[PDB]
Amino acid sequence: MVDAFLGTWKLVDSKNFDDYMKSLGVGFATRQVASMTKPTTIIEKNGDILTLKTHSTFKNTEISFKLGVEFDETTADDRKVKSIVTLDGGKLVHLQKWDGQETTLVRELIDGKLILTLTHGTAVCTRTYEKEA
Ligand SMILES: CCCCCCC(O)O
């Protein structure tokens, strides 16, 4: 069910990421560096456990989770959130909750590219990843 998402992906297009980061309260210097980085995202499974790594010259993260089971997460911008990831309409939907706030990170495959849509407040960011061989 998750298998077309698996692999190594590189950022090749980003729209409105500054808006998204600013909405989350990320400081200007961090937004500035992040606007020029191109992360690599690695998605792997082992049975029911998925591991999602995000690597760059600036920040690295890693999360492991089962679909549909809440997990604690500390995000790249240091929010301590309650997270759940599920498949919805063939999209991989990651919901983060903290302080009564929410943000969604939705991943969808379109023509072999991985489209990540990030929503917080009114900010909507679209980031496109292409698969590494
Ligand atoms: C600021 C929170 C994390 C943003 C992740 C962006 C990505 O391309 O994976």
- CA-CA distance, 46 to 48, in Å (whole number)? 6
Residue ID of nearest Cα to ligand 1 atom 3:
76
Ramachandran quadrant class, 72 (left: phi over 0; alpha: psi -120 to 50; beta: rest): beta
Q: Residue 21, class by beta-carbon neighbours within 10 Å (0-12 exposed, 13-18 middle, 19+ buried)?
A: buried
- All structural domains of the chain, each given as residue ranges with its CATH number in brackets, are 7-132 (2.40.128.20)
Contacts of 86 (CB under 8 A, 6+ apart): 67, 68, 92, 93
User: 20, 15, 62, 14: which is closest to 41 by C-alpha?
Assistant: 62
Q: How far apart are CA 17 and CA 123, in angstroms?
A: 9
Supply φ then ψ for residue 73, to 5 degrees. -140, 145
**Solved with:** X-ray
**Is 54 touching ligand 1 by the criterion CB < 6 Å?**
yes
In whole angstroms, what is the distance from residue 85 CA to residue 83 CA? 7
The CB density around residue 72, as the number of other CB atoms within 10 Å, is 10
**Per residue in 89-100, is it b (16+ CB within 10 Å) or e — as a string?**
eeebbbbbeeee
Q: How many CB atoms lie within 10 A of CB 36?
A: 9
Give, as one character, the DSSP assignment of residue 33.
H
Kindly give the number of the ligand 1 atom that is closest to the alpha carbon of 14: 8
- Grouping H, G, I as helix, E, B as strand and the rest as coil, residue 60 is coil
Ligand 1 contacts CB of residue 37 (under 6 A): no
